């Protein structure tokens, strides 16, 4: 997260770190057994790390639970990043309370203008690289589809939305991928892609979670 702020330990209780020997992506806990992340975060041998603030220090609220399976969206296209969504099932149910909590799936797609909270342990620099230890947060509005498409001609599908700031300076970034965009207490987005980070007129592009609720629910119901 570029131009964000330190969330505060466990203030984003549904934020998970996907770990394969190191943090490589974010994810969002959507029930005790399931995490939503970006399909482009897919890899085998994922350990989901919940309860985590400083990802480099055991601070006492972590739950580390290996994935038992991952399910990449049937229509995920890694070239276009269309349908950049996956589900990761935990081998065991996470223990839920205030510091580790699922985030509700949306009942309806959020609108351009809605403020959201985007979070992750990704790069905090637009130029060069600095990875934070602790979870970073960014409040960012959903951008209109038109501005999103204008920013990224020929690239924005109905399964994507832009959020952030056209002026740049504030954005998700590499390592935030797969993490949440939560708006009004609902997971509306998944950190998906963008051209660099916090660049002018290159806002973050997010998987439009509301499009996937049926798929998420039915997948969970049968897996």
Point out which residues bind Ca ion (CB under 5 A).
Answer: 52, 54, 59
Contact 171, 2 (CB under 8 A): yes
CB 46 within 8 A of CB 71: no
CA distance 156 to 209: 14
Dist. CA 122–CA 133, nearest whole Å:
9
Nearer to ligand BRN, 13 or 194 (CB): 194
Task: Answer with the entry of Ca ion, ligand BRN, none that 59 interacts with (C-beta below 5 to 8 A by kind).
Answer: Ca ion
172 marked among binding-site residues: yes
Q: Closest CB to ligand BRN among 99 and 202?
A: 202
Query: In whole angstroms, what is the distance from residue 16 CA to residue 219 CA?
Result: 20
Burial of 158 (0-12, 13-18, 19+ CB in 10 A): exposed
Query: Taking CB under 6 A as the rule, which mask of x and - marks residues 144-183 in contact with ligand BRN?
Result: ---------------------------xxxx-xx------
Residue 173 binds what, of ligand BRN, Ca ion, none (CB under 5 to 8 Å, by partner type)?
A: ligand BRN
201 is known to lie in a ligand binding site:
no
Rounded to an integer, what distance in angstroms lies between the CA atom of residue 101 and that of residue 160?
Answer: 25
Which of ligand BRN, Ca ion, none is residue 114 near (CB under 5 to 8 Å by kind)?
none
Give CA–CA dist 39/61, Å, rounded: 27
For binding to ligand BRN (CB under 6 A), which residues are involved?
40, 78, 81, 171-174, 176-177, 191, 193-194, 197, 204
Q: Which residues are annotated as a binding site?
A: 52, 54, 57, 62, 171-172, 174-175, 177
């Amino acid at each position: 997260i570029v131009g964000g702020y330190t969330c505060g330990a466990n203030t984003v209780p549904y934020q998970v770190s996907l770990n394969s020997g190191y943090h490589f992506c974010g994810g969002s806990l959507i029930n005790s057994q399931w995490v939503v992340s970006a399909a482009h975060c897919y890899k085998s041998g994922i350990q989901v790390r919940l309860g985590e603030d400083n990802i480099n220090v055991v601070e006492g609220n972590e739950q580390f639970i290996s994935a038992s399976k991952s399910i990449v969206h049937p229509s995920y296209n890694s070239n276009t990043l269309n349908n950049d969504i996956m589900l990761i099932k935990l081998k065991s149910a996470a223990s839920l309370n205030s510091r580790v909590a699922s985030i509700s799936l949306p009942t309806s797609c959020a609108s351009a203008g809605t403020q959201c909270l985007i979070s992750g342990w990704g790069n905090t620099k637009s130029s060069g690289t600095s990875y934070p230890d602790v979870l970073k947060c960014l409040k960012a509005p959903i951008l209109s589809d038109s501005s999103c498409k204008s920013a990224y001609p020929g690239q924005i599908t109905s399964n994507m939305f832009c959020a952030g700031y056209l002026e740049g300076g504030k954005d998700s970034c590499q390592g935030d991928s797969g993490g949440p965009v939560v708006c009004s207490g609902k997971l509306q987005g998944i950190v998906s892609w963008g051209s660099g980070c916090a660049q002018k007129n290159k806002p973050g592009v997010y998987t439009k979670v509301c499009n996937y609720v049926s798929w998420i629910k039915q997948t969970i119901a049968s897996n």
